[PDB]
Design a protein around this ligand. Structure first.
Ligand SMILES: Nc1ncnc2c1ncn2[C@@H]1O[C@H](COP(=O)(O)OP(=O)(O)CP(=O)(O)O)[C@@H](O)[C@H]1O
Ligand SMILES: [Ca+2]
Ligand SMILES: [Ca+2]
Ligand SMILES: [Mg+2]
Length: 972
């Protein structure tokens, strides 16, 4: 079947020989799966390796590896080789971490098979099957929120209008409108295919059914499968540019003051200002950020949270407002009518009711109606036969038994599905239900109703009108059509001009209208926090011939002069872990707002339950309806958002505008939503969160999907986001505060006229050792002990602080007055070696010199005090690295064994530094045999940078040993 849209409806129905209302036979599926395979897709090798070197810091440090190798034919290659080993080492961590997380996100999406609603011949009702079991033939049904599972030709549209979001397939950011007439153009583009749906795209409004015409690869989305920065990064890429600007400054600022063949020898000092450049250049800044960001995506994918955009975690470390949809998201969406009432009698102003309770918290259609905790037969209550009529004929939902889980599931919206379940429990027509199975009883009594009443068309739901009409005619006429409605109570009773009392109608009164809203206030504020709907019927509707449904704004006009019948009260439990989250957030410095279209009375009562409010807290300033907000003065309407914690009876435009107002206050907002109404607010907010059980359009439009439906996962992402930015700051403090020393070790050396500090092969070794995997592995750092007890980060404030700058000199100056303080100790105050005086040492730049009496000028050509400064900078920078586990938490509170990966790193970079000083062929390649008398001093010197930085920690903070102390006692 090619170009179905050329062909008409019955044509494509003939091609598969299916009845539209029956669907595909059982072996017809067997054959067709043997002719088109499943409905799935079978999902570079070294490209990840090459992507690491695409960053500025390793693009330029790829040059220094070839510049010092330019001079190879002129040790010579040991300089460029050591620049590789720090670039190669960091580049391997990232590709490792990246492939770790990749499998994870692909492990979680695979957990949940995408179901899809078909019409095979076994069950007389719609049923949910795995997407891959769909074949080109069976009738398929979809509705608002559903992703399309296969390529479908439309056959019938139940709602007035159908709206598909084809963005993922075509890119058009608008919802198109479909039809069922044939498009003749046989080469028409996907966008001009207005009678077809395609996998992966979602339904924005309406509900319809068609027949599959392609699967797997043959679908438009499959046909093109093989042919297809972050807010913290721009903060670091404005940094990576600036340091190199100062690096190459200071570096060539070294190269000049030294030169003063006398010019061919000026190319030595070039490899210095080049190697010293690589030394104070963070080769691993772009690797350590791709590391941590990949890690979190793996951390979250572990907790049943698919992260769809990588900066989601980063921004969540700063969120100060987390708005959330009530129904579905903050509630389990496990609905069942447990209270209902109709009118008993009405005499004058006063009136009485006939209330009822109904058992059964599950969607399962088992339960009984009580009057006063006593069961009753509903046929005796004439008003109940009608409430039951409305509740099954205004339903776009249906019950579907899941024989795998042995439990009942919903087909459509939970709210509607609770009603289908209720009309089963009533059985107002007293049909004999004894001989029917767990599947026949999912939609049993509705069928009797739907068999007595011909539903000719429905006027679908509209969240601004907040009600849903249905047109019907009895099957034996003579012409007596009627109209049934169900909608928001406040709204429906507004349009109700009459009330039915049993089987008779009477005009609406003030007092009657009162009682209703009190029951509903009783119901929504009670221990159950009921979610209530009104149910009324129009007795003299306008003929279908004289109706105008092209403009849906007419719908509310036709739903007028109604007869009120009754109200239902369904229960909705809050999610279990939710009351903890709002406790955890108010401590992390985060506000939690509720945005809902339901009753303010009920929405507040939930907020009282879960801890947004408390039963006694006055809420007059923190809860406003949609109307109570737009009907305010702009100043009070301003500081409302500042303090309001609940917004109810609210359309998606509001939630989109609510988040907007938060953001206009420089607030970083998160949005937690389940359904279509949350779609604008999800995109609008900085980050949107969708529920796994929710809709696809809610999931697609949002940027992180809790497939768990766990609500405490949100907090964990905020800890990840706060932990990633915090790992940077220490990593920042390490390389930055440690290289002020490598510059002063050189610049102090020049100012005092001292002997040579280092050599360009030594300059790039100590870069490798301290700035290789040791520095890099700082990203696995343990989250701080009090990370979620402090307000969130404000992104517009700068990265580095003036107290932190001061802490970089206080360790940069020290590691420099320690790198050169050890080489001067071997010339002035050492036992085995020269006793050169300070004056004699600074003017060393002759046998004739009487100031240099009794000294072989050859002692300045000795590698001894060079590895006294080389192994001091390695040891002291491993020490400073051990300071860099936390900004202020000392090593008494955060011991170094908590970070396993900086430990296993420092031990590897000392195993590679100790292997260089005592092996056979290396002390000559590196110009360098140090033992106990000298290694104790390098310990005596490199260790105080532990305490010196510790005393910085102790002062900013106020505004183990069995192992530690024997090591120090040897030293002193
Ligand atoms: N299929 C449906 N038919 C008739 N009325 C419906 C309906 N679905 C919802 N309503 C009514 O619309 C009103 C508001 O609906 P809306 O879609 O804006 O939010 P909501 O009630 O579904 C709760 P939440 O916003 O937390 O998901 C509800 O009070 C309900 O009475
Ligand atoms: Ca470096
Ligand atoms: Ca360094
Ligand atoms: Mg919802």
């Amino acid at each position: 079947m090619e170009n179905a849209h050329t062909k008409t409806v019955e044509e494509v129905l003939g091609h598969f020989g299916v009845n539209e209302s029956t669907g595909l036979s059982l072996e017809q599926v067997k054959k067709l799966k043997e002719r088109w395979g499943s409905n799935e897709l079978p999902a570079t090798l070294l490209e990840l390796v090459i992507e690491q070197f695409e960053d500025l810091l390793v693009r330029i440090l790829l040059l220094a590896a070839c510049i010092s190798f330019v001079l190879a034919w002129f040790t010579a290659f040991v300089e460029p080789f050591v620049i590789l080993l720090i670039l190669v080492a960091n580049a391997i961590v990232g590709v490792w971490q990246e492939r770790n997380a990749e499998n994870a996100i692909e492990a979680l999406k695979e957990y949940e098979p995408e179901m899809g609603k078909v019409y095979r011949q076994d069950r007389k009702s719609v049923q949910r099957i795995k997407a891959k079991d769909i074949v080109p033939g069976d009738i398929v049904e979809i509705a608002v929120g559903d992703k399309v599972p296969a390529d479908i030709r439309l056959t019938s549209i139940k709602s007035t209008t159908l709206r598909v979001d084809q963005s993922i397939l075509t890119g058009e950011s608008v919802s198109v409108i479909k039809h069922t007439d044939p498009v003749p153009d046989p080469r028409a583009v996907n966008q001009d295919k207005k009678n077809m749906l395609f996998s992966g795209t979602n339904i924005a409004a309406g509900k319809a059914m068609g027949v599959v015409v392609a699967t797997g690869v043959n679908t438009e989305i499959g046909k093109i499968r093989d042919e297809m920065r972050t807010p913290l990064q721009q903060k670091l890429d404005e940094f990576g540019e600036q340091l190199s600007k100062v690096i190459s400054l200071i570096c060539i600022a070294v190269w000049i003051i030294n030169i003063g063949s006398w010019i061919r020898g000026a190319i030595y000092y070039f490899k210095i200002a080049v190697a010293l450049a690589v030394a104070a250049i963070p080769e691993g800044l772009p690797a350590v950020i791709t590391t941590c960001l990949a890690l979190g995506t793996r951390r979250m994918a572990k907790k049943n949270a698919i992260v769809r955009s990588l900066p989601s975690v980063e921004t969540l470390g700063c969120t100060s407002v987390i708005c959330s949809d009530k129904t579905g998201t903050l509630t389990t969406n496990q609905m069942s009518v447990c209270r209902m009432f109709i009118l008993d009698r009405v005499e004058g102003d006063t009136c009485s009711l006939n209330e009822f309770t109904i058992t059964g918290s599950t969607y399962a259609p088992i339960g009984e109606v009580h009057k006063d905790d006593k069961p009753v037969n509903c046929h005796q209550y004439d008003g109940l036969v009608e409430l039951a009529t409305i509740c099954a004929l205004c339903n776009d939902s249906a019950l579907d038994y899941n024989e795998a889980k042995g439990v009942y599931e919903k087909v459509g919206e939970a709210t509607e599905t609770a009603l289908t379940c209720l009309v089963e429990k009533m059985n107002v027509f007293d049909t004999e239900l004894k001989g029917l199975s767990k599947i026949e009883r999912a939609n049993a009594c509705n069928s009797v109703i739907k068999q007595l009443m011909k539903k000719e068309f429905t006027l679908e739901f509209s969240r601004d009108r907040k009600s849903m009409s249905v047109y019907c005619t009895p099957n034996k006429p003579s012409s007596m059509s009627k109209m049934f409605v169900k909608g928001a109570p406040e709204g429906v009773i507004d349009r109700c001009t009459h009330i039915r009392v049993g089987s008779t109608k009477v005009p609406m009164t003030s007092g009657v209208k009162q009682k209703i809203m009190s029951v509903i206030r009783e119901w929504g504020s009670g221990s159950d926090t009921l979610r209530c709907l009104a149910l009324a019927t129009h007795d003299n509707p306008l003929r279908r011939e004289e109706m105008h449904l092209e403009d849906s704004a007419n719908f509310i006009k036709y739903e007028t002069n109604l007869t009120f019948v009754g109200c239902v009260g369904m229960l909705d439990p809050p999610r279990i872990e939710v009351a903890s989250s709002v406790k955890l957030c108010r401590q992390a410095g985060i506000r939690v707002i509720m945005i809902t279209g339901d009753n303010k009375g009920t929405a507040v009562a939930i907020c009282r339950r879960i801890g947004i409010f408390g039963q006694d807290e006055d809420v007059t300033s923190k809860a406003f309806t949609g109307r109570e907000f737009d009907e305010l003065n702009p100043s009070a309407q301003r500081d409302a958002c500042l303090n309001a914690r609940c917004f109810a009876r609210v359309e998606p435009s509001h939630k989109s505008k609510i988040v907007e107002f938060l953001q206009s206050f420089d607030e970083i907002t998160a949005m937690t939503g389940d359904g279509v109404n949350d779609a604008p607010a999800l995109k609008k907010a900085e980050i949107g969160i969708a529920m796994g059980s929710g809709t696809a359009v809610a999931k697609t439009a949002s940027e992180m999907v809790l497939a768990d439906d766990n609500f405490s996962t949100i907090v964990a992402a905020v800890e990840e986001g706060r932990a990633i930015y915090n790992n940077m700051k220490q990593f920042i403090r390490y390389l930055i505060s440690s290289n002020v020393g490598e510059v002063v070790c050189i610049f102090l050396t020049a100012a005092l006229g001292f002997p040579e500090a280092l050599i360009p092969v030594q300059l790039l070794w100590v870069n490798l050792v301290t700035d290789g995997l040791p520095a890099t592995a700082l990203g696995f750092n343990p989250p701080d002990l009090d990370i979620m007890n402090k307000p969130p980060r404000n992104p517009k404030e700068p990265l580095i602080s003036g107290w932190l700058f001061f802490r970089y000199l206080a360790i940069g100056c020290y590691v420099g007055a320690a790198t050169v303080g050890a080489a001067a100790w071997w010339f002035i105050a050492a036992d085995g070696g020269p006793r050169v005086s300070f004056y004699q040492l600074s003017h060393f730049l002759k046998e004739d010199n009487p100031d240099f009496e009794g000294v072989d000028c050859a002692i300045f050509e000795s590698p001894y005090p060079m590895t006294m400064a080389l192994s001091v900078l390695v040891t002291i920078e491993m020490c400073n690295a051990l300071n860099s586990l936390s900004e202020n938490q000392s090593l008494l509170r955060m011991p170094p064994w908590e970070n396993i990966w900086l430990v296993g790193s420092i031990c590897l970079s000392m195993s590679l530094h100790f292997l260089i000083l005592y092996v056979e062929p290396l002390p000559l390649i590196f110009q360098i045999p140090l033992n106990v008398t000298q290694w104790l001093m390098v310990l005596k010197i490199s260790l105080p940078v532990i305490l010196m930085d510790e005393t910085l920690k102790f002062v900013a903070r106020n505004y183990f040993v069995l192992l530690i102390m024997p090591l120090v006692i040897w030293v002193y």
